[PDB]
Design a binder for these strands. Structure first.
Ligand SMILES: COC(=O)[C@H]1[C@@H](O)[C@@]2(O)c3c(OC)cc(O[C@@H]4O[C@@H]([C@H](O)CO)CO[C@H]4OC)cc3O[C@@]2(c2ccc(OC)cc2)[C@@H]1c1ccccc1
Ligand SMILES: Nc1ncnc2c1ncn2[C@@H]1O[C@H](COP(=O)(O)OP(=O)(O)NP(=O)(O)O)[C@@H](O)[C@H]1O
Ligand SMILES: [Mg+2]
Length: 373
RNA sequence: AGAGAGAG
């Protein structure tokens, strides 16, 4: 445990970028994981939502970069285009002063423009989503020759059944000596088993499941009775609220579109976000929510992981998540870096089992919503 | 399953 960025043997010009970004003291995960990452160990880093995992790996990557080698030295993957873009902006701002280059390799962007930029000069760090990154590797416009660090953010999503093969196909193009770093708020037992295909006696920084939920996010439930409409329950509640910014999670794209329309039909101002929209529209919606121009986003799990909007203080689970790990991530959209937030769960009878599994596994208190608001 | 995840 190192409690000061000055105590981490970081180059002075990386420190200029850290302090310019506004950080003053390292968070708990930063105090524990930056040094092992810099030293080149494989690291599994679990830590509570919103406590600074991004800068943990960005700082470690930037300290390792050989700036005058104009070649890609580090590859970071994320499960969604929005998260990859967010991560890219953090690395680029931390690395700006020292002159590290960081390029986003994500789907839905002009390929010719990207290929020309890569042809101009290989960026030091690539942050991307797996499909586009593997495409660029396969076309040979991205070279793995000097990649010595491979970071999976949201690692347990990236190593799930639907992604692990994409990750493994990219991993095949990397040198055997590549350092591997995995970070997530959740690290379930099945994923930790999978990590042996990727990693060599790694350092494990884990959180006890009964201590994972954030103290500052008050969790509540509302029972929806059999004859009641969940839509009325949300609208009645939504009226009695003064929102700064809020996220409402829905399990399907179809239902996001439907709910957005219903809410507009009751003169509520919301915007919708999901993965079947054009990337230009996704970018606009995200930008307007980050800036505070729209106050309430209705979304799928596209935005459950990693997305950081400080002003979000309210999460509503209109549908409960289909796996318990996404519960942690969804409610973690509020309460970023020690702010107090609220999460509200709508619970129909068929939802009780799901919510019960969440409560007992994480040993967390979910209380009946009071009238205080 | 859902949700994500290249190009054309
Ligand atoms: C089991 O096979 C796979 O894992 C493959 C396929 O799944 C794959 O083709 C694949 C998709 O299939 C429907 C969809 C996909 O995203 C969706 O659809 C995109 C397009 O619309 C659909 O093509 C648009 O964006 C996404 O919606 C927004 C990415 C993707 O990448 C793949 C791929 C295949 C070849 C390739 O270079 C030759 C690059 C990517 C997977 C892959 C394989 C290795 C490494 C990473 C990813
Ligand atoms: N040392 C720090 N001091 C102050 N703010 C910080 C520090 N590190 C990170 N932050 C901010 O805390 C917020 C959360 O950081 P982020 O890296 O997104 O968290 P995370 O641990 O990855 N959360 P998640 O992916 O949802 O599990 C961002 O606004 C960061 O700028
Ligand atoms: Mg994160």
């Amino acid at each position: 445990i190192v409690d000061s960025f000055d105590d981490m043997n970081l180059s002075e010009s990386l420190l200029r970028g850290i302090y310019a970004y506004g950080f003053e003291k390292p968070s708990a995960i930063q105090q524990r994981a930056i040094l092992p990452c810099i030293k080149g160990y494989d690291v599994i880093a679990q830590a509570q939502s919103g406590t600074g995992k991004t800068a943990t790996f960005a700082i470690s990557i930037l300290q390792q970069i050989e700036l005058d080698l104009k070649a890609t030295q580090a590859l970071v993957l994320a499960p969604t285009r929005e998260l990859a873009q967010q991560i890219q902006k953090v690395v680029m701002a931390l690395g700006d002063y020292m002159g590290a280059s960081c390029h986003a390799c994500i789907g839905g962007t002009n390929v010719r423009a990207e290929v020309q930029k890569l042809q101009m000069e290989a960026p030091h760090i690539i942050v991307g989503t797996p499909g586009r990154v593997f495409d660029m590797l396969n076309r040979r416009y991205l070279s793995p020759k000097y990649i010595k660090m491979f970071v999976l953010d949201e690692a347990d999503e990236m190593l799930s059944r639907g992604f692990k093969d994409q990750i493994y196909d990219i991993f095949q193009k990397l040198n055997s000596n590549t350092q591997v770093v995995l970070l997530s708020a959740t690290m379930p037992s099945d994923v930790l088993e999978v990590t042996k295909k990727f990693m060599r006696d790694p350092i494990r920084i884990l959180v006890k499941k009964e201590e994972l939920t954030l103290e500052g996010i008050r969790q509540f439930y509302i029972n929806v009775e059999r004859e009641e409409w969940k839509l009325d329950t949300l609208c009645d509640l939504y009226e009695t609220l003064t929102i700064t910014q809020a996220v409402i999670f829905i399990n399907t794209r179809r239902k996001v579109d439907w709910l957005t329309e219903k809410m507009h039909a009751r003169d509520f101002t919301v915007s919708a976000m999901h993965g079947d929209m054009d990337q230009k529209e996704r970018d606009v919606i995200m930008r307007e929510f980050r800036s505070g121009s729209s106050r309430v986003l209705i979304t799928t799990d596209l935005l459950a992981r990693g997305i950081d909007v400080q002003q979000v203080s309210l999460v509503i689970n209109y549908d409960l998540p289909t796996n318990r790990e996404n519960y942690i991530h969804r409610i973690g959209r509020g309460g970023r870096f020690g702010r107090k937030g609220v999460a509200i769960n709508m619970v129909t009878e068929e939802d009780k089992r799901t919510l019960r599994d969440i409560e007992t596994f994480y040993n967390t208190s979910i209380e009946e919503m009071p009238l205080n608001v």
